[PDB]
Amino acid sequence: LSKGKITYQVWGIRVRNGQFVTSSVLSFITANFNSNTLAGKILGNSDYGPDVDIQNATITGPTFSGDATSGGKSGKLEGKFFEVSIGGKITFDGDRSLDTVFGGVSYEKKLDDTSQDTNHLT
User: Fold this and answer.
1) In which compartments does the protein localize (predicted)?
2) Which residues are CB-neighbours of 62 under 8 A, at least 6 positions away?
3) What domains, with CATH codes, occur in the chain?
């Protein structure tokens, strides 16, 4: 994970009414391994509830973290990189019903991408 961009296709899980419900037209998260930045959005639905937005997260080695917002609440993102895959968790201290674990697989890899941005690959 030394350079390039990977755009992942991701799904979150929340608990609603004593069951696990998934999120989501696709949810992307993009990791830029040049600039060590990450961004994306988990799209919800009526059961999973509000979308999760991730602007300007950070990458260090095979780990990433940052802030997220969902339903007006701010969350703390932590996750890992492992077709390759990604997973993580987002905690919302102001409303813990928004807490979610997510995972995903690579949608598009550009390992020789030399851009600095976290715009999704298509």
Assistant:
1) Cell outer membrane
2) 1, 80, 81, 82
3) 1-122 (2.40.160.90)
